[PDB]
């Protein structure tokens, strides 16, 4: 559900074709206004914890805005999530799994990693069962669980005079609502 | 825990946060006024009208 969630917010780079018509509002807004050079939502996983969030690269006058759109998208997904965009989120992930396991090296990685982490290799049918399981309510219940009213770990490097204050970032991690 | 049980169900949402404040304030007003009235009335025992009202009133 968190992979589906990160797929809805998606990822953008200035070399992308779609630009203003992109599905994920953060990319659309970032493309139209030209807020950032790139952003990427990640879910880094470890044994009993991880890092769920996002990364962006932008002009020094665009940090507050990018942050505002990004957190706006998190809060939105926590509170309100359309069935259509979640289906897009699923399909992006469906395509991601099958795209990634093509060639032998990614499959050999998947095996070697799976047995150390998951314990067993997980079939694509099992993954599909868990993707098909996810609907709009699940995304909201899960996004809101991990992101709503939670202190986030923030890392800023470069011309970051605009980077919002932690209290203001922390205020953005819940809504008005 | 004690305080987490309040957070979890009573004021995680900002929607219920306000409902808690409003209802809590509604009760607080009754509680505090009543208490501080009684404290002031015990502080000033026998000197106010309500203490000496029965005195000059057969009705």
């Amino acid at each position: 559900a968190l992979q589906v969630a990160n797929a809805i917010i998606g990822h953008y780079d200035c070399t992308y074709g779609g630009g203003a018509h992109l599905s994920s509002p953060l990319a659309s807004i970032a493309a139209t206004n030209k807020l950032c050079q790139s952003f990427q939502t990640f879910n880094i996983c470890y044994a009993d914890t991880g890092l769920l969030g996002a990364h962006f690269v932008c002009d020094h006058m665009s940090i507050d805005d990018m942050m505002f759109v990004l957190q706006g998208q998190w809060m939105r997904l926590c509170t309100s999530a359309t069935e259509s965009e979640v289906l897009r989120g699923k399909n992006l992930l469906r395509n991601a799994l099958v795209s990634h396991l093509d060639g032998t090296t990614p499959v050999c990685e998947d095996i070697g990693r799976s047995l150390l982490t998951y314990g067993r290799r997980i079939p694509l049918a099992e993954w599909e069962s868990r993707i098909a399981e996810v609907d709009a309510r699940v995304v909201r219940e899960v996004c809101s669980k991990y992101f709503y009213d939670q202190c986030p770990a923030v890392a800023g490097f470069g011309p970051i005079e605009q980077l919002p204050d932690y209290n203001r970032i922390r205020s953005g991690m819940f809504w008005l609502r | 825990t004690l305080t987490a049980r309040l957070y979890s169900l009573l004021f995680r949402r900002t929607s219920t946060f306000a409902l808690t404040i409003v209802v809590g304030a509604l009760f607080f007003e009754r509680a505090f006024d009543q208490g501080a009235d009684a404290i002031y009335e015990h502080i000033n025992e026998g000197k106010l009208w309500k203490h000496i009202k029965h005195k000059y009133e057969n009705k």
């Binding site: 309100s80 | 929607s15 306000a18």
Partner: peptide
């Protein structure tokens, strides 16, 4: 959809608050 329980809760907040103040 999702603002129905929120707007109902704010509807209560407004209702009980207006009752509180008067």
């Amino acid at each position: 959809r999702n603002w129905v329980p929120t707007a109902q809760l704010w509807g209560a907040v407004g209702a009980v608050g207006l009752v509180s103040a008067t």
